[PDB]
């Protein structure tokens, strides 16, 4: 019943940019928290954005710098990120993540890939 | 051209005395409203003396408690501070400043480089 | 209303300070109250503290049509509801010999309807009583004497104060035979007995769940009078400390809570408290880039004076909120048990004028 389905992702130019979407269903939305996390071969999964349910309060991963921006539509069950400048070192899985503790969830992951 | 430079610096017992001097080139001080600051270790620069070109008066930081003078010689174009029962407290950098306004306010024109003075007991 | 909005934005982030320095320990504040006397002090200032006072503030109370909005502000939160229910004041102070600028006080009388007071300070005692009288009468006698005027002495030349009472009576009243001593669970994890008002009735209600996870219980209650409501806020677990509130607290942000609230039922138990905070404005103002005033020879006043330098030696802030049971065809009873909310933690509330914005009280209450 719960499902996180994420999409956007894909081969990139360095420089170019990306908007990763994912769509929710099967739990109270408009309650949760929504995260990006990323995660390639040999590291662990990493926070790279998070938003607050309303009122717009964010939080970004230190390597971000400005570049990523996350946003939701409660109304419409969808988290959004819109990466740009994008480099070889964002080269990554990218992973939707609701949460409002202790419950949390996790979709399947997009490949962002870059060069 | 125009350049402000102190002299008056060295070492002073716990309740001796010391003269500091500013000399001005390329002005003259009584236009200007002219002011003493300091920094200390530690601290940030703050306010000791100030003459207000509006009428001549002195003033003081409350720090001071009636024991510096701050004259201005004329003749001289020179500014003065007369340091009095100086205390290990009194230890510091002294810079001298002016500025085109009838009173001592930020920002100011002119900074001197500045003056070491050590109050050791 | 665009200067409400402006000045609750200012007020709450100098509360924001107040509070990281008042880590577990209570705080009551006004937001309009210090955005209030920082306007009249605009007016005595000029050059480089006149900006950093501005850019803080985000607008100039010399520009059209902003001084006029302030005492329709003013008049729109208090003509309300009255009697010895709230009660504010500000007042500047500055040393009686000094040759002020020509026109000023005239020109002060104009735009705030008050003058700036002058005293003798050298007059020691004196000065302490008329200051303190100023604040005592204007406040009903409901707040006790201020402490940081031991500060003032025969060198003090400018001093500001600003006052704030507040004792409301609700919309609904909490039903009086509910009210009980319950255990407070405190910061540090020990509790203490206290007495707790309860409450069944349909609430505005909303949670919160911050960019971690941790959710919020927000509550609205409104004040008799349909016009103000005071807001609650606290984490629903206890582990979370209300300094991850406080850290991203802003006034448009409690406006985005109300705006997205629902009607609904609930069995609210809440403390009775009392609260009296007074704050040194010195370190909360520097912090948000109004060095300059504070400083001699530094302090730009030349639109006060330009015969003698002038600083701000002390500048104050006292409120005092009450928080009781009392309020003022068909009512129908609920068939089923409403769900419950105890506040037994550490919680925020803010007093807010729903139709401008204005944001009257702000506070934490970390034992009450």
Same mark, same amino acid.
């Given at each position: ?115 | ?8 610096? $060295?070492?002073?017992?716990? *309740?001796? #005395?010391?003269?500091? =001097?500013?000399?001005? %080139?390329?002005?003259?001080? +009584? ?10 270790? $530690?601290?940030?620069?703050? *306010?000791? #003396?100030?003459?207000? =070109?509006?009428?001549? %008066?002195?003033?003081?930081? +409350? ?21 009095? =029962? ?36 | ?368």
């Amino acid at each position: 019943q719960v499902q996180l389905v994420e999409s956007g992702g894909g081969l990139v130019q360095p420089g170019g940019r990306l908007r990763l979407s994912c769509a929710a269903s099967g739990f109270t939305f408009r309650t949760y928290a929504m995260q990006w996390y990323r995660q390639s071969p040999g590291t662990e999964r990493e926070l790279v954005a998070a938003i607050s349910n309303i009122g717009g309060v964010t939080d970004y991963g230190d390597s971000v710098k400005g570049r990523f921006t996350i946003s939701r539509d409660n109304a419409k069950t969808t988290v959004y990120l819109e990466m740009n400048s994008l480099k070889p070192e964002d080269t990554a899985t990218y992973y939707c993540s609701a949460v409002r503790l202790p419950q949390r969830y996790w979709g399947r992951g997009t490949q962002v890939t870059v060069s | 051209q125009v350049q402000l430079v102190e002299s008056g610096g $060295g070492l002073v017992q716990a *309740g001796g #005395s010391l003269r500091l =001097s500013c000399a001005a %080139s390329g002005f003259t001080f +009584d236009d200007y409203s002219i002011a003493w600051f300091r920094q200390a270790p $530690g601290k940030e620069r703050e *306010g000791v #003396s100030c003459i207000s =070109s509006s009428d001549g %008066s002195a003033y003081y930081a +409350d720090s001071v408690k009636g024991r510096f003078t701050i004259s201005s010689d004329n003749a001289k174009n020179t500014v003065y501070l007369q340091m009095n =029962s100086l205390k290990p407290e009194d230890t510091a950098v002294y810079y001298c400043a002016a500025v085109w306004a009838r009173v001592c306010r930020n920002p100011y024109d002119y900074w001197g480089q500045g003056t070491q003075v050590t109050v050791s007991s | 209303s665009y200067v409400a909005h402006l000045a609750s934005d200012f007020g709450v982030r100098v509360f924001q300070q107040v509070a990281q320095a008042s880590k577990d320990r209570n705080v009551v504040f006004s937001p309009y109250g210090v955005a209030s006397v920082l306007a009249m002090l605009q007016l005595t200032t000029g050059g480089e503290t006149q900006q950093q006072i501005q850019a803080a503030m985000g607008f100039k109370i010399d520009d059209k049509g902003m001084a006029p909005a302030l005492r329709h502000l003013y008049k729109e939160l208090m003509g309300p509801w009255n009697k010895d229910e709230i009660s504010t004041t500000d007042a500047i102070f500055v040393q009686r010999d000094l040759k002020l600028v020509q026109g000023f006080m005239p020109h002060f009388f104009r735009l705030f309807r008050s003058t700036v007071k002058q005293v003798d300070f050298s007059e020691v005692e004196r000065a302490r009583f008329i200051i303190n009288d100023w604040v005592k009468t204007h406040t009903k006698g409901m707040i006790s004497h201020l402490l940081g005027t031991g500060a003032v002495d025969q060198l003090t030349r400018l001093v500001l104060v600003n006052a704030l009472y507040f004792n409301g009576q609700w919309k609904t009243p909490f039903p009086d035979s509910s009210t009980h001593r319950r255990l407070f669970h405190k910061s540090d994890g020990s509790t203490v007995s206290v007495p707790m008002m309860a409450q069944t009735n349909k609430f505005n209600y909303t949670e919160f769940t911050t960019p971690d996870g941790h959710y919020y219980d927000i509550l609205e209650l409104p004040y008799h009078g349909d016009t103000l409501s005071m807001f609650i806020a606290a984490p629903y677990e206890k582990e979370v400390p209300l300094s991850a509130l406080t850290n991203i607290l802003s006034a448009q942000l409690i406006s985005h809570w109300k705006g997205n609230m629902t009607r609904l039922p609930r069995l609210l138990v809440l403390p009775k408290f009392s609260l009296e905070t007074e704050v040194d404005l010195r370190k909360p103002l520097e912090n948000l880039g109004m060095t300059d005033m504070f400083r001699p020879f530094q302090a730009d006043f030349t639109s006060l004076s330009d015969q003698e330098p002038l600083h701000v030696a002390l500048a104050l802030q006292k409120v005092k909120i009450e928080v009781n049971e009392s309020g003022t065809a068909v009512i129908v009873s609920a068939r089923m048990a409403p769900e419950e909310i105890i506040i037994d933690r550490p919680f925020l509330f803010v007093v807010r004028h729903n139709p401008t914005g204005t944001v009257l009280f702000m506070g934490q209450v970390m034992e009450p």
